[PDB]
Write a protein that binds this ligand. Structure first.
Ligand SMILES: OC[C@H]1O[C@H](O[C@H]2O[C@H](CO)[C@@H](O)[C@H](O)[C@H]2O)[C@H](O)[C@@H](O)[C@@H]1O
Ligand code: NAG
Length: 246
């Protein structure tokens, strides 16, 4: 399991949590020195539990699929919640089975459905350590519209920061003030599958992407990534979605 406490949190303790989160995900191989997540894991071992604590010390446990870093559901006191999607329903066969009741949330976990439930794109939702504290608090009691926005904050500040060092730094910069994600942050989120596939296809193509990946940079400039020498590959991405899952 991994844990993170908002009480006393700072860029360093957040960086330790994101390091623990990356290190809890299993891999047998690296591709261009980036851990390659597994094609599959059977049974309960597929799910990592993240214990998160708000500033007041109240806690939720979040279940994360270790093959793709997708959050499946969470437990808050004696109630479990899961997204309305087959992978989450399967996860509910393994985690939080001791909850007194299980609520299936009225959306799946993808960004498009969550933004629809929330009423706003994530371009408009501030993220940061304070927004994470609010998100944990929100998730403690069911409200499905408030929860969709909390879950947009939780996905970006947890499993997204684990995938990209740039996003982790963006959250560290928002340790004490939220701010909406940069368009670079959004681009990388949206590109993770694509990047993970191109970096794998580069292995028998001399380091060259079969198809270029278009990203927005930190200045808001739209760039093409064409090969593994790009700083996105050598410095930023930390985890590759296995092509078997793409
Ligand atoms: O269920 C949690 C994960 O959501 C993030 O990605 C979501 O949004 C995508 C929308 O474009 C979907 O393809 C995907 O199903 C969603 O899961 C992210 O992938 C993970 O870090 C979150 O844990
Ligand atoms: C690879 O990447 C860099 C951009 O970061 C580019 O300048 C260079 O021309 C590319 N090399 C090849 C072999 O495509």
């Amino acid at each position: 399991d991994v844990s993170f406490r908002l009480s006393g949190a700072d860029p360093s303790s957040y960086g330790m949590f994101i390091k623990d989160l990356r290190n809890a995900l299993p891999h047998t191989e690296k591709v261009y020195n980036i851990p390659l997540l597994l094609p599959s894991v059977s049974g309960a071992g597929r799910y990592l539990l993240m214990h998160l604590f708000n500033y007041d010390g109240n806690t939720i446990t979040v279940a994360v699929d270790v093959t793709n870093v997708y959050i499946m559901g969470y437990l808050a006191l004696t109630t479990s919640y899961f997204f309305n999607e087959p992978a989450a329903d399967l996860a509910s066969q393994y985690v939080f089975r001791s909850a007194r009741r299980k609520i299936t949330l009225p959306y799946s976990g993808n960004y498009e459905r969550l933004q629809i439930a929330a009423g706003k794109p994530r371009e408009k939702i501030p993220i940061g350590l304070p927004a994470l504290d609010t998100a944990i608090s929100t998730l403690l009691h069911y409200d499905s519209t408030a929860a969709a926005g909390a879950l947009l904050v939780l996905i970006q500040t947890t499993a997204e920061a684990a995938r990209f060092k740039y996003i982790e730094q963006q959250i560290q910069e928002r340790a004490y003030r939220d701010e909406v994600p940069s368009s670079a942050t959004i681009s990388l989120e949206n590109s993770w599958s694509g990047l993970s596939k191109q970096i794998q296809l580069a292995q028998g193509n001399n380091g060259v992407f079969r198809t270029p990946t278009v990203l927005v940079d930190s200045k808001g400039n739209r760039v093409q990534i064409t090969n593994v020498t790009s700083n996105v590959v050598t410095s930023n991405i930390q985890l590759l979605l296995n092509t078997k899952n793409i």
